[PDB]
Design a protein around this ligand. Structure first.
Ligand SMILES: NC(=O)CC[C@@H](N)C(=O)O
Ligand SMILES: NC(=O)CC[C@@H](N)C(=O)O
Lengths: 252, 252
């Protein structure tokens, strides 16, 4: 069968790797909407229109299911997607909430997400409806202004502290909605102390087991709506080798 | 006297601190053009028009000299600024080149700069006219697409390696035009091995000694063209305390 996967960037290539490795024969089409790259800032409805278009493009590429590996899109576009694309649609939020609810002990769990994903309340609601005291904070948006220059040393593990304030000693499991410097993973586990961090990518990939008929030609096709700067090198580093990419709407 | 300092962001607050500390009485007006925050991408002439406007705003605020702490602006706008603002204008490139030329031993020196600053050839020319074999590379622009998630561990010190390839064992001094994850400072010195990294901020601040009449009321005024998200917190962390900021063109 053929799996379609989309994301606003190259982050979805992680989930895509989990899947390709677990589902050996399955065919895969990837769409990274690099042309509109900063999704997480835009309004709910723009997130929805963008998603509908990328999911429509994957559908017209003959795919059987659609995995939206983007937190923000998953948070606002899932319903609309399911209702308009006539295929099974899967997001990265529910397998993470499940994995969080499961892995916890004290049911006090934190979520570091994009200001737009944190704003939807999707994780919050889903965690609470699982009997959880949720501690959620938005991704710190620093790079636009400042560089990792000021933000190095003192200030890096002072921004962490201040940001993961409420989490201090109440949570034991964390959903890493998204990490952006200085709130990297190694920096946050060292402040929170060793906590069980959800692997949303393995949870998602694993989660499609019942829907996936593990059959096909192991084909992979990469598509992006903007052939951005170092994208071609990012691919070689995430997938392990060089994979040829196409501009979404080229030969088609 | 009054010193005007501008930057596209909050990075100039570092130079501003060096200056305030070295020139105890000097008055200071700061303008961060946060509204148009990603300068380093825009064309030369747009960089020049933007600069002219910020320098004009500082001039109309009665300042005596203007420090452009931005590499990109310094690289393309200095001439035009001097020619149109009737005051002494100082950039961050020449004090760094001087400090590089001086500190070297083998006159083989590298420059990690923004794609636009690296493109101007300003450092290159100035280093070469000082008898230097320059090794320059542009800042890797990753955050738009990818997050520091993929880029953590293996890939962080693999992007470094690949990027600081030509520098390997030929340079002994580096001008850190600008650092953006994963090419942080601690990550780059560990690959290049211990090399003498130029402190462009202390070089610039020190460099204004002959022009500065160390007199005034030690006043500080912060202005930004966009009262961005976590800007107010970035200030408390760089300067050490809370400083009230104004929107450029508010009360004026
Ligand atoms: N794989 C991911 O972490 C996706 C993150 C992305 N959904 C975000 O909101 O930043
Ligand atoms: N202080 C600085 O490093 C300024 C850097 C800034 N000029 C840049 O080009 O990114």
């Amino acid at each position: 069968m053929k799996i379609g996967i989309f994301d606003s960037g190259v982050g979805g290539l992680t989930v895509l790797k989990a899947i390709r490795n677990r589902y050996r024969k399955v065919d895969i089409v990837y769409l990274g909407d690099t042309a509109r790259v900063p999704y997480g800032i835009r309004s709910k409805d723009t997130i929805i229109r963008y998603s509908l278009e990328c999911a429509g493009f994957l559908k017209d590429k003959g795919v059987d299911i659609i995995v939206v590996a983007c937190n923000t899109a998953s948070a606002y576009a899932l319903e609309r997607l399911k209702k308009e694309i006539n295929v099974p649609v899967f997001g990265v939020i529910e397998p993470g909430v499940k994995e969080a609810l499961k892995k916890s002990r004290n049911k006090k769990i934190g979520v570091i997400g994009t200001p737009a994903t944190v704003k939807s309340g999707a994780y919050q609601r889903k965690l609470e409806e699982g009997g959880a005291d949720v501690f959620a904070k938005a991704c710190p948006l620093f790079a636009p202004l400042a560089e990792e220059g000021l933000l190095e040393g003192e200030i890096t593990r002072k921004v962490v502290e201040h940001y993961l304030k409420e989490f201090k000693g109440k949570i034991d499991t964390l959903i890493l909605g998204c990490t952006h410097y200085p709130l990297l993973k190694k920096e946050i586990k060292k402040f929170l102390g060793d906590a069980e961090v959800v692997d949303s990518s393995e949870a998602l990939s694993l989660s499609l087991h019942n829907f996936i008929k593990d059959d096909g030609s192991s084909s992979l096709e990469l598509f992006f709506t903007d052939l951005s700067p170092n994208l071609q090198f990012l691919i070689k580093l995430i997938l392990g080798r060089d994979y040829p990419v196409k501009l979404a709407e080229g030969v088609f």
